[PDB]
Amino acid sequence: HQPLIARDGPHPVEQPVHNYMTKVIDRRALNAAFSLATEAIALLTGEAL
């Protein structure tokens, strides 16, 4: 809700608007990668031992 102030005078009475403020989210990727040499593939799995 947003603040109001009652005010003197017949000016039309404070018309109170009460809403649900919405928003729009965003999306980023943030990607990163890493090294894996053909060696240390035959290894690791156990191919070359």
Buried/exposed code over 5-18 (b: 16+ C-beta within 10 A; e: otherwise):
eeeeeeeeeeeeee
Cβ 19 to a second copy, closest distance in Å? 12
Phi-psi label, residue 24: left if phi above 0, alpha if psi -120 to 50, beta otherwise: beta
Cβ 46 to a second copy, closest distance in Å? 24
Cβ 2 to a second copy, closest distance in Å? 13
For binding to a second copy (CB under 8 A), which residues are involved?
A: 4, 6-10, 12-16, 28-35
Q: Which is nearer to a second copy, 12 or 46 (CB)?
A: 12
